[PDB]
Amino acid sequence: SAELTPILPFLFLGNEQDAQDLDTMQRLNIGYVINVTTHLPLYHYEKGLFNYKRLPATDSNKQNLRQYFEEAFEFIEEAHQCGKGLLIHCQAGVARSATIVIAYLMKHTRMTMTDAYKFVKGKRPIISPNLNFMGQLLEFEEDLNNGVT
């Protein structure tokens, strides 16, 4: 239908080409876009249709994504509470964006990390491996089971 991938009714996951399909954004009621890259444009910006957030992550083995989790969740919840969708995207393999969606699932739906991962991967089967992102997620999991995020 749309390389754009539904995770929740208000949350979708995509790559670069995914986030460039305007028709699909609109028929799915997406009002919000999170762009997890430093260098890509905010696609469709000058139509003045969407609420945007850049998370300017880089090509790095040491990219810290944890520092953005909370900001991302607030933007997601903003979309959610107003009855609109949010598209979160990066580039091919969606490793940055997948990381943030899995973290969102673990915090707000109580899914274990491995369960959160399986849920997303069952919907989007090409998730590139970032051992550094996975270690951050495991760290986040420990932090949620002690009450200190």
PDB file of C-alpha atoms in Angstrom:
ATOM      1  CA  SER A   1       0.000   0.000   0.000  1.00  0.00           C
ATOM      2  CA  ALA A   2       2.550   2.420   1.322  1.00  0.00           C
ATOM      3  CA  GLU A   3       6.171   1.563   2.061  1.00  0.00           C
ATOM      4  CA  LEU A   4       5.129   3.803   4.969  1.00  0.00           C
ATOM      5  CA  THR A   5       4.490   1.325   7.749  1.00  0.00           C
ATOM      6  CA  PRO A   6       1.751   1.556  10.404  1.00  0.00           C
ATOM      7  CA  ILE A   7       2.911   0.657  13.909  1.00  0.00           C
ATOM      8  CA  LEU A   8      -0.003   2.183  15.860  1.00  0.00           C
ATOM      9  CA  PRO A   9      -3.108   3.888  14.423  1.00  0.00           C
ATOM     10  CA  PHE A  10      -1.288   7.236  15.031  1.00  0.00           C
ATOM     11  CA  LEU A  11       2.328   6.118  14.504  1.00  0.00           C
ATOM     12  CA  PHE A  12       4.061   5.188  11.270  1.00  0.00           C
ATOM     13  CA  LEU A  13       7.618   4.242  10.317  1.00  0.00           C
ATOM     14  CA  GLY A  14       9.374   4.939   7.038  1.00  0.00           C
ATOM     15  CA  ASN A  15      12.517   5.714   5.130  1.00  0.00           C
ATOM     16  CA  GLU A  16      13.414   8.723   2.960  1.00  0.00           C
ATOM     17  CA  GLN A  17      11.353   7.682  -0.057  1.00  0.00           C
ATOM     18  CA  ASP A  18       8.464   6.718   2.234  1.00  0.00           C
ATOM     19  CA  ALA A  19       8.246  10.222   3.674  1.00  0.00           C
ATOM     20  CA  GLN A  20       8.115  11.813   0.191  1.00  0.00           C
ATOM     21  CA  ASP A  21       4.697  10.291  -0.726  1.00  0.00           C
ATOM     22  CA  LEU A  22       2.236  13.089   0.012  1.00  0.00           C
ATOM     23  CA  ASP A  23      -0.925  11.307  -1.069  1.00  0.00           C
ATOM     24  CA  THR A  24      -0.158   8.519   1.392  1.00  0.00           C
ATOM     25  CA  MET A  25       0.580  10.904   4.268  1.00  0.00           C
ATOM     26  CA  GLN A  26      -2.828  12.528   3.790  1.00  0.00           C
ATOM     27  CA  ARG A  27      -5.016   9.431   3.310  1.00  0.00           C
ATOM     28  CA  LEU A  28      -3.533   8.107   6.566  1.00  0.00           C
ATOM     29  CA  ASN A  29      -4.262  11.366   8.421  1.00  0.00           C
ATOM     30  CA  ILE A  30      -0.625  11.987   9.323  1.00  0.00           C
ATOM     31  CA  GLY A  31      -0.288  15.517  10.710  1.00  0.00           C
ATOM     32  CA  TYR A  32       3.214  15.250  12.193  1.00  0.00           C
ATOM     33  CA  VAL A  33       6.683  14.296  10.936  1.00  0.00           C
ATOM     34  CA  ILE A  34       9.834  13.384  12.880  1.00  0.00           C
ATOM     35  CA  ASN A  35      12.982  13.434  10.669  1.00  0.00           C
ATOM     36  CA  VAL A  36      15.830  11.581  12.382  1.00  0.00           C
ATOM     37  CA  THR A  37      18.663  12.917  10.223  1.00  0.00           C
ATOM     38  CA  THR A  38      20.823  16.002  10.123  1.00  0.00           C
ATOM     39  CA  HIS A  39      21.050  16.436   6.374  1.00  0.00           C
ATOM     40  CA  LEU A  40      17.710  15.543   4.736  1.00  0.00           C
ATOM     41  CA  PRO A  41      15.113  18.247   4.033  1.00  0.00           C
ATOM     42  CA  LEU A  42      11.772  18.396   5.791  1.00  0.00           C
ATOM     43  CA  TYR A  43       9.886  16.997   2.825  1.00  0.00           C
ATOM     44  CA  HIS A  44       6.718  18.919   1.879  1.00  0.00           C
ATOM     45  CA  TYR A  45       7.732  21.712   4.279  1.00  0.00           C
ATOM     46  CA  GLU A  46       6.574  24.550   2.023  1.00  0.00           C
ATOM     47  CA  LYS A  47       3.102  23.185   1.604  1.00  0.00           C
ATOM     48  CA  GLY A  48       2.489  24.240   5.212  1.00  0.00           C
ATOM     49  CA  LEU A  49       0.584  21.050   5.960  1.00  0.00           C
ATOM     50  CA  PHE A  50       2.594  19.320   8.757  1.00  0.00           C
ATOM     51  CA  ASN A  51       4.081  19.811  12.220  1.00  0.00           C
ATOM     52  CA  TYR A  52       7.740  18.898  12.102  1.00  0.00           C
ATOM     53  CA  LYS A  53      10.583  17.900  14.441  1.00  0.00           C
ATOM     54  CA  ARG A  54      14.184  17.275  13.349  1.00  0.00           C
ATOM     55  CA  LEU A  55      16.298  14.933  15.482  1.00  0.00           C
ATOM     56  CA  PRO A  56      19.666  15.661  13.830  1.00  0.00           C
ATOM     57  CA  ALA A  57      21.358  12.260  14.214  1.00  0.00           C
ATOM     58  CA  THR A  58      24.445  11.468  12.121  1.00  0.00           C
ATOM     59  CA  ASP A  59      26.221   8.527  10.465  1.00  0.00           C
ATOM     60  CA  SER A  60      27.982   7.258  13.582  1.00  0.00           C
ATOM     61  CA  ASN A  61      28.766   4.181  15.605  1.00  0.00           C
ATOM     62  CA  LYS A  62      28.522   6.467  18.627  1.00  0.00           C
ATOM     63  CA  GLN A  63      25.308   8.315  17.753  1.00  0.00           C
ATOM     64  CA  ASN A  64      23.433   8.875  21.011  1.00  0.00           C
ATOM     65  CA  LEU A  65      19.688   8.455  20.409  1.00  0.00           C
ATOM     66  CA  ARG A  66      18.533   8.118  24.042  1.00  0.00           C
ATOM     67  CA  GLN A  67      18.970  11.885  24.506  1.00  0.00           C
ATOM     68  CA  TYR A  68      16.049  12.405  22.007  1.00  0.00           C
ATOM     69  CA  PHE A  69      13.616   9.700  23.246  1.00  0.00           C
ATOM     70  CA  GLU A  70      11.616  11.980  25.561  1.00  0.00           C
ATOM     71  CA  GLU A  71      11.379  14.801  23.014  1.00  0.00           C
ATOM     72  CA  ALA A  72      10.182  12.321  20.407  1.00  0.00           C
ATOM     73  CA  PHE A  73       7.575  10.839  22.715  1.00  0.00           C
ATOM     74  CA  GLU A  74       6.109  14.271  23.470  1.00  0.00           C
ATOM     75  CA  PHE A  75       5.719  15.022  19.777  1.00  0.00           C
ATOM     76  CA  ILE A  76       4.149  11.561  19.282  1.00  0.00           C
ATOM     77  CA  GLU A  77       1.741  12.108  22.164  1.00  0.00           C
ATOM     78  CA  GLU A  78       0.910  15.515  20.711  1.00  0.00           C
ATOM     79  CA  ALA A  79      -0.155  13.913  17.478  1.00  0.00           C
ATOM     80  CA  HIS A  80      -1.965  11.159  19.359  1.00  0.00           C
ATOM     81  CA  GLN A  81      -3.994  13.324  21.724  1.00  0.00           C
ATOM     82  CA  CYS A  82      -5.183  15.515  18.857  1.00  0.00           C
ATOM     83  CA  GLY A  83      -6.371  12.591  16.711  1.00  0.00           C
ATOM     84  CA  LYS A  84      -3.659  12.880  14.046  1.00  0.00           C
ATOM     85  CA  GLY A  85      -0.879  10.497  12.940  1.00  0.00           C
ATOM     86  CA  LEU A  86       2.901  10.884  13.184  1.00  0.00           C
ATOM     87  CA  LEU A  87       5.430   9.668  10.632  1.00  0.00           C
ATOM     88  CA  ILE A  88       8.913   9.062  12.017  1.00  0.00           C
ATOM     89  CA  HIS A  89      11.634   8.482   9.422  1.00  0.00           C
ATOM     90  CA  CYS A  90      15.349   8.350   8.676  1.00  0.00           C
ATOM     91  CA  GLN A  91      16.949   6.508   5.727  1.00  0.00           C
ATOM     92  CA  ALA A  92      17.169   3.003   4.313  1.00  0.00           C
ATOM     93  CA  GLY A  93      17.186   0.369   7.036  1.00  0.00           C
ATOM     94  CA  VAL A  94      15.316   2.731   9.364  1.00  0.00           C
ATOM     95  CA  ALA A  95      17.694   1.920  12.211  1.00  0.00           C
ATOM     96  CA  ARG A  96      17.485   5.344  13.846  1.00  0.00           C
ATOM     97  CA  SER A  97      13.721   5.699  13.515  1.00  0.00           C
ATOM     98  CA  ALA A  98      13.019   2.052  14.376  1.00  0.00           C
ATOM     99  CA  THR A  99      15.062   2.573  17.511  1.00  0.00           C
ATOM    100  CA  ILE A 100      12.885   5.496  18.532  1.00  0.00           C
ATOM    101  CA  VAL A 101       9.627   3.665  17.807  1.00  0.00           C
ATOM    102  CA  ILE A 102      10.724   0.636  19.794  1.00  0.00           C
ATOM    103  CA  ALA A 103      11.649   2.886  22.718  1.00  0.00           C
ATOM    104  CA  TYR A 104       8.249   4.573  22.392  1.00  0.00           C
ATOM    105  CA  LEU A 105       6.600   1.131  22.554  1.00  0.00           C
ATOM    106  CA  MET A 106       8.574   0.070  25.600  1.00  0.00           C
ATOM    107  CA  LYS A 107       7.754   3.180  27.582  1.00  0.00           C
ATOM    108  CA  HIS A 108       4.137   3.818  26.596  1.00  0.00           C
ATOM    109  CA  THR A 109       2.889   0.258  25.938  1.00  0.00           C
ATOM    110  CA  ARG A 110       4.964  -1.615  28.538  1.00  0.00           C
ATOM    111  CA  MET A 111       6.377  -3.992  25.930  1.00  0.00           C
ATOM    112  CA  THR A 112       9.658  -5.646  26.760  1.00  0.00           C
ATOM    113  CA  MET A 113      12.426  -4.582  24.481  1.00  0.00           C
ATOM    114  CA  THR A 114      12.543  -7.895  22.635  1.00  0.00           C
ATOM    115  CA  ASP A 115       8.731  -7.826  22.347  1.00  0.00           C
ATOM    116  CA  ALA A 116       8.798  -4.234  21.129  1.00  0.00           C
ATOM    117  CA  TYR A 117      11.389  -5.192  18.529  1.00  0.00           C
ATOM    118  CA  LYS A 118       9.480  -8.243  17.355  1.00  0.00           C
ATOM    119  CA  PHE A 119       6.308  -6.125  16.997  1.00  0.00           C
ATOM    120  CA  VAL A 120       8.041  -3.597  14.766  1.00  0.00           C
ATOM    121  CA  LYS A 121      10.012  -6.160  12.800  1.00  0.00           C
ATOM    122  CA  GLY A 122       6.882  -8.154  12.138  1.00  0.00           C
ATOM    123  CA  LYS A 123       5.490  -5.011  10.534  1.00  0.00           C
ATOM    124  CA  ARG A 124       8.740  -3.724   8.897  1.00  0.00           C
ATOM    125  CA  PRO A 125      11.041  -6.740   8.253  1.00  0.00           C
ATOM    126  CA  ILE A 126      14.187  -4.793   7.089  1.00  0.00           C
ATOM    127  CA  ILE A 127      15.665  -3.318  10.280  1.00  0.00           C
ATOM    128  CA  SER A 128      19.384  -2.717   9.934  1.00  0.00           C
ATOM    129  CA  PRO A 129      21.561  -3.769  12.844  1.00  0.00           C
ATOM    130  CA  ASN A 130      22.978  -1.093  15.087  1.00  0.00           C
ATOM    131  CA  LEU A 131      24.551  -2.767  18.090  1.00  0.00           C
ATOM    132  CA  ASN A 132      25.044   0.670  19.661  1.00  0.00           C
ATOM    133  CA  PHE A 133      21.321   1.455  19.323  1.00  0.00           C
ATOM    134  CA  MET A 134      20.417  -1.945  20.769  1.00  0.00           C
ATOM    135  CA  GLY A 135      22.641  -1.332  23.773  1.00  0.00           C
ATOM    136  CA  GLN A 136      20.971   2.006  24.338  1.00  0.00           C
ATOM    137  CA  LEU A 137      17.551   0.328  24.186  1.00  0.00           C
ATOM    138  CA  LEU A 138      18.624  -2.317  26.712  1.00  0.00           C
ATOM    139  CA  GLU A 139      19.878   0.520  28.946  1.00  0.00           C
ATOM    140  CA  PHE A 140      16.519   2.287  28.535  1.00  0.00           C
ATOM    141  CA  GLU A 141      14.769  -0.965  29.509  1.00  0.00           C
ATOM    142  CA  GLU A 142      16.794  -1.197  32.708  1.00  0.00           C
ATOM    143  CA  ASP A 143      15.945   2.449  33.441  1.00  0.00           C
ATOM    144  CA  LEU A 144      12.214   1.881  32.971  1.00  0.00           C
ATOM    145  CA  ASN A 145      12.175  -1.131  35.332  1.00  0.00           C
ATOM    146  CA  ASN A 146      13.703   1.033  38.084  1.00  0.00           C
ATOM    147  CA  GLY A 147      11.560   4.142  37.569  1.00  0.00           C
ATOM    148  CA  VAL A 148      14.216   6.669  36.552  1.00  0.00           C
ATOM    149  CA  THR A 149      13.694   7.915  33.004  1.00  0.00           C
TER     150      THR A 149
END
